[PDB]
Assembly symmetry: C3
Homo-oligomer: 335 residues x 3
């Protein structure tokens, strides 16, 4: 049983990167040890200075992605420093019992706890905070991320053939509910607690003020664009802990997609747009064949371009005229 | 043909239970006879006394689940007593022709009708009222339920192996559109007809005031929690006749899920959250492995916790530390 | 390579028809040449005279469906006449690179351009306009349609058996965001440009004023109902370039459905309601077995009946009492 196995300790890395790991492995099961520390902080979430009284695992939206293999045990130490105001906990969708671990990880400021569970199902799974009586607030304020449980022999196509990625990225998409005052301007709160009531009223409308990748409008653009090269297969992990989304790569595809995120199921191929149910993480593979700056976005184009749910992927390599060619550049219409 | 076969008569039971039935059967096709009686009534739908001018099959939201086997004929007598104000009918998504039967079951108050159709496709299917010119109102006011057509040889996994459940529950999720007056308080109407215009205006906003399981906030909690035991496989049938939802079991999984609800298709496994398209019923199996009180909810957590789309499942049995263990209880952070 | 192959020229036809084409073909790859001309125009979109400052490919919402076979090259000439006010382009979800072709087809009024790309994946794919900085506006104002890339050997069921349709229809579903003035009446704009700011404010609410098939409430009803006969298999192509939808045939099924729209994946069978992710096109086959007027609709019934997302299919042939029979017509309840 779990008390017999070797332990490993993993150092997490900040999104959109994912900590180094193997896909197919000859390793046997391990107890894999992680630690996360909660940070409440005010964050600027758009280009005009709007702030969110935010709550995070490890300082980031999303929290870092934790990667283990099927049959491993996840052993998380969750730290709630005294510098925080609220209690927190963690609910792993990949875990069985005790409301995902929530019932066993209730940490007031100044406390920590350690949870172990068996990661017995392969897939990308949401984890999120879920304190009794204030679950949606802690989720929408930023407290979610992904646990990826890889099959021990790596990813497989519908015919059981091997699949792999060369590079992985993790995108958390956050529907935010920022209140406005009578002047129509977004409210700025001195403390987390003061934002609560007004935010619940906005939540209940079901209309986000902003929908952002990785914590801010344009998080994944400019200097912070994702990167790849022609010939590389990228895994795009997409989590939405509260609300549906519909990822899409402009000028690309989901070559192999697990939209419900569970790797024991066959993936679908050649997707234009896939669907991440609120409360889940999904996974897409794409092998770049053309260089250029791509957009990766939620294809409700209002959600993407107006509300913030879009990033960029800058891809190096050589252009392929067989795949696409400008035959006649824009030029006057003929007489 | 159908005029040759034996008839059976089934007595329906109220949600969340489902009438006794076999899964795999050695029985041949039958004409299976059901009756439902429509009841219009005012219902209290939340903890603060809000009322809905509701419309129901058999007095309940959802209507009872009807269970037959593929190749059976469903023979429904639909009774509209004179104590009701409106005309009604029934549209079975499992039926072929005549707008699901709607065109053939138009019953004014004081009338009844009898419809037969062949249940030639396996699956969970929505049925709902659909009177010409007032379809959405009758649906959102409570007039829907599920027909479950089981394959004759029972449920199968993607490899054709047998699946089964030990206990079945039926959950209908209702997006409600209750109007408010100028004081911001929900309106209470003396009659069904008086609620119509105001309700259509709320409907057109696409924002529900409440989203409830089985007719009321907290319907499936406390004394009315669903129940199971460690080692039991439960089937959770989930219908949403008007609007999408995303079911999830906190601390569990969808072990095998037909999210589109059609059993001739292979199920997906190991789901964290699945998706019920508005206008459909889906089905999930889960074998409990840990005792405790679970939540079963729509994982738009605002919809669940603010608006009402959540229930509880209380599960007896022994805790399994291999699956999950508290390694260190919440305790002060060390120096 | 592509410079070697034969060229063909296709004449497009207006929705809901689809230009003649073969399914399974013994033909080898071709460069298939199409032309589309953009028309900006004011259109009446409902029964009370509401107008949309609309943008279209070829004068229609949706644009025409383009049909090729896997391994063909699509060669589109896109014409933006001088009679238009805005620049436009095209983003084909079926194409690889250059933001779907958008970067290579930027045409100001009075200009045209010609794009070739390899249609290397089978499926129904959205194409839409995507001018830098005004993508959602051009999409929601009507600038989308479908490219259908058929497998060279035709459609296949999950076991590799042949499937086919006898008749194809193309339905584009449009979430519209028409502004109102202080009097609560929809605004009418003298020019396209004047509609922009007010429309963006409505877009940002995420609540459509109207949701229509093929450009107008009731587009596909009355004289313009779709038609079929008992024994015919119809393909229903359903595109939604911006927002999710949930198609359903009342009194029918999706016999075989590719809801994500990609034919190399196995279809699901016996669907009651399927799901088209915003930003995608899907495809359903249904073989009619009963005559009558069907409804084909988005099964958010508010979206369908209140907001406009419904059409009719009028089906000729003989009634089948084995499939459905009125056993007792509506009649008084007995003493
Ligand atoms: Cu928290
Ligand atoms: Cu959860
Ligand atoms: Cu009714
Ligand atoms: Cu229906
Ligand atoms: Cu345009
Ligand atoms: Cu697109
Ligand atoms: Zn140990
Ligand atoms: Zn590779
Ligand atoms: Zn008989
Ligand atoms: Zn059992
Ligand atoms: Zn040539
Ligand atoms: Zn045919």
């Amino acid at each position: 049983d779990a008390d017999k196995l070797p332990h490993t300790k993993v150092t997490l890395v900040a999104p959109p990167q994912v900590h180094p790991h193997e896909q197919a492995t000859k390793s046997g099961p391990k107890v894999v040890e992680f630690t996360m520390t909660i940070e409440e902080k005010k964050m600027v979430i758009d280009d005009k200075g709007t702030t969110l009284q935010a709550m995070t695992f490890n300082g980031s939206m999303p929290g870092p992605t934790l990667v283990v293999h099927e049959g491993d045990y996840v052993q998380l130490t969750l730290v709630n420093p005294a510098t925080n105001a609220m209690p927190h906990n963690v609910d792993f969708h990949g875990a069985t019992g005790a409301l995902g671990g929530a019932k066993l990880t209730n940490v007031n400021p100044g406390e920590q706890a350690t949870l172990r569970f068996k990661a017995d199902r392969s897939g990308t799974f949401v984890y999120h905070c879920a304190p009794e009586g204030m679950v949606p607030w802690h989720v929408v304020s930023g407290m979610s991320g992904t646990l990826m449980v890889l099959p021990r022999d790596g990813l497989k196509d519908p015919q059981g053939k091997p699949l792999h990625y060369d590079r992985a990225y993790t995108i958390g998409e956050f529907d935010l509910y920022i209140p406005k005052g009578p002047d129509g301007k977004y409210k700025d709160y001195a403390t987390l607690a003061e934002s609560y009531g007004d935010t619940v009223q906005v939540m209940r409308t079901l209309t986000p003020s902003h929908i952002v990748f990785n914590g801010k409008v344009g998080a994944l653009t400019g200097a912070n664009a994702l990167t790849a090269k022609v010939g590389e297969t990228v895994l795009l992990i997409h989590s939405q802990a509260n609300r549906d989304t519909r990822p899409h790569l402009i000028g690309g595809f989901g070559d192999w997609v697990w939209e419900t995120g569970k790797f024991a199921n066959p993936p679908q191929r050649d997707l234009e747009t896939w669907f991440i149910r609120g409360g889940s993480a999904g996974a897409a593979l794409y092998t770049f064949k053309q260089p250029g700056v791509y957009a990766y976005l939620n294809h409700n184009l209002i959600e993407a371009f107006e509300l913030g749910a879009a990033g960029h992927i800058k891809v190096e390599g050589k252009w392929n005229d067989d795949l696409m060619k400008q035959i006649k550049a824009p030029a006057p219409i003929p007489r």
